[model samples]
Target: MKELNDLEKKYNAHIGVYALDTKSGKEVKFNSDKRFAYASTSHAINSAILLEQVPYNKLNKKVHINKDDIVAYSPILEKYVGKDITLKALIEASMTYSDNTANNKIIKEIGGIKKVKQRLKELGDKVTNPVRYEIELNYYSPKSKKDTSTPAAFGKTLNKLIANGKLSKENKKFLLDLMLNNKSGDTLIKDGVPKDYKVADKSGQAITYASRNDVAFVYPKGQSEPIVLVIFTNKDNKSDKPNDKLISETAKSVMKEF
Candidate 1:
């Protein structure tokens, strides 16, 4: 992406981008083999694994919020601490709002951090290392160790899930709906897409402004499937939203090619 290259230089940020065309089985990579922090993007995979264990209808089953699961910045679960919520609602809170508290609870239910890592590894995403709970990161801890993965590794995982039909129809659609209806990070890979098109995606950003990443499956007009795109920005200004603009610009440029 020539536009992306220029934008990276302008923002003085390191960027990695990966794209896959599902219908044609074509792919594009730009520093995609490089590594970056996973940020909240890890929730997409975590939520997928959770859904695999609990059926959609079972999502209404209520689960309690152990005192340990409570954390800050939980828009949905904070109010319900020491209370109960349905598993389905918890998953929604995690995906739509990127609620850390909700994610921690789901993580515990699906076994633990180790189990999540093992689940991902079984899916052939060997390089994605999510070693800690979301609560472990204070967002401003520059020296804090965090989860990591390469664009190629993460992109390949998504492509494999859809291309190989790894997920059941119901589960696949359920996960896709969560991402498509996502309420956060609107200025990432989805920034450039036309309203007529559909997109299922997840976005991640480090609290220190260290990275901004997004992975998306974009369904062009009338297409049954979608094109996959994964983009990450690192070392950018955290106080401003220029990286968001850069992602939008890059998406617009990439769309012209398809």
Candidate 2:
């Protein structure tokens, strides 16, 4: 993140980053409020809301995951599937490990993509077209469409939640804790962040013939607040595939200043 401001300007990219914390706070901006695909990070936000709204204690509780519950894995999620699993475990698997199956299952249980959007709307977020299904490669979308969410709005929402204590105490605590154990693509905020720091974060990515993205949050050491940092890219290559290391570079640039 050291000289990222210039690099970001170089990639025809636009970003909106802002942090609010017990240390220092502000709604600093780049493309402040601009919208972009949220990728997988929405799973964390939606999952927390779903768990808060659902009557889990009143319903039958068991880790009863079925094959249908898990979507096709992108080589990452495939490692965790089995015959049966609990809902809570699935939530962690989805968020902490960036598992596609865990995300799809949570999407299903929360009702559908529409429900997820509705839940966010109830929280006062102005996100657009939280679209899914027909375009998702995990399913047989003739169009190869992708599920999508956005950055600025997502960032502000997280900002709002933190400032307002938006989630139930139990759900909030669970989310903050789960973020601590996120193990996938660990080269970003986790890369150079001081070991003692706590990062309440989420990240997202997608792959198809022509699109890709990566994003997450950063909470520096001794800070009770965090910044919403997002990065997205769309490549026009049949083979211009994602580069994890480059993604790390982008994240690293941001982290230097983050």
Candidate 3:
């Protein structure tokens, strides 16, 4: 409590967290009820929804990556612009590179933003409403409610994807592997935990409000289940540094408390 409060006051920010022990279902929380824009962290949730919508046999289906689909920050997808890419590849690109183009393509394939929102509600996520495409929503303002999610709501919703029932065994394994190997945010939550323990995560950041977020599944060596964690933070523009260090510090505190 002291650490969290101090961090918030120092940065002029609001920080929220939700963590659960998969084995015991024990939870640890701090300001988890407050709403915050999840930013790119929404990819983890949307990735699960996409997997559920596309059947295993159809993953090879291809979509045209138009010139317009090529956008900034889409590292993996940029090379494939104006070419055809498979659903499987797009999913990988989206998860691995935080490729907005890949995500938008997949969103269109599974349906649209409306369908994604419906899936969130169906999967028991009461908060989190993604209002625009990846580009517009990536850098959100503090006051905009667009693309909002609470720590627990997203933490539990993501839990449903990995815990059981929502996805087939094969599909679940695929998403887990993707997250475990996702190349982004190497210095965020991953820095906080012990170097040996594995933390599979998705991270997000924005400019105007200094919003930064990460949601992950952490494996404690020798444990039968991993810990589910979700953290969201937003600081005033006057704050100079980004929240990467803060997120790592918070994750370290969470481990100590655990």
Candidate 4:
């Protein structure tokens, strides 16, 4: 409590945090009702929907590429524009690097943002929505338009999917493995735990510089079950490093209990 209070004052921001112990089925939350821009973490949801629509074995199915769909920082598919790509590679690109071009393709393959929203609704998720393409969607201001979710809502959905077998074993394993091997967010929740601890999570940074978010399923040593931790921080005009530090500190404080 003291650590969180200090973080709140030091950052001059609103913070939402949620943690669940899968072993005992206990949960804890702080400021979980507030929503924040989800950013690339939306890709996790996209991965889920993609898996729902196409099995892992069928990931080799190919898609044609176009130049207009490409975006910056796309490590996997940028070079392949105007060529053919497979569903597996697109999902890999989206999960590992949060590639915008790959995400758009997957969204297209799954029937677009409307289908993503409809799938979420069918699952009874109320607070998360994907309204536009990550790169193609324009906002007059940072707050004008974006994907969004509450800490509680996203965390709950993530854990529910992990526990409920809604996804086939092969698909679930594929997703968690990709998350653990993610190429970004080294200073977020990953900084908070021991080197040997395993984490499956996605990190997000709003383009407006208003927030940094990470949702993780952490596997501490000697534990059969994992912990689901979600942290979202909103600060006015602060650069990413400080917000990342805030998330790291929060993760460290929370992990000490386990």
Question: Each model's TM-score, in the order given?
Answer: 0.89, 0.73, 0.92, 0.90
Q: lDDT scores for all predictions?
A: 0.77, 0.55, 0.81, 0.79
Instruction: List candidate 2 stretches off by more than 4 Å.
Output: 1-5, 9-24, 54-60, 74-84, 133-146, 161-163, 192-196, 208-217, 234-239, 244-258
- Clash pairs, candidate 1, are none
Best-matching candidate per TM-score: 3
List the pairs of residues colliding in candidate 2: 1-252, 1-253, 1-254, 38-149, 40-204, 63-85, 63-86, 135-145
Model 3: ten consecutive residues of lowest lDDT: 234-243
Backbone clashes, candidate 1: 0
Off by over 4 Å in 4: 136-146, 238-242
Scored against the true structure, residue 225 in model 1 reaches a CA lDDT of 67
lDDT computed for candidate 2 = 0.55
* Candidate 4 lDDT, 175-199, residue by residue in tens: 8899999858788999887887888
> What root-mean-square deviation over C-alphas does model 4 reach?
2.3
Please provide, for model 1 over 106-207, each residue's C-alpha lDDT reduced to its tens digit, 9 standing for 90 to 100. 888889989987877888788877778885542533344457778888887777765454567777787789899996758777778777778888887776
lDDT of 4: 0.79
Candidate 4 or 1, higher TM-score: 4
RMSD of each: 2.4, 4.6, 1.9, 2.3
Full candidate order by lDDT, most accurate first: 3, 4, 1, 2
lDDT of 3 by residue, 62-100 (tens): 999889877678888888877899888888888888888
Residue pairs clashing, model 3 = none
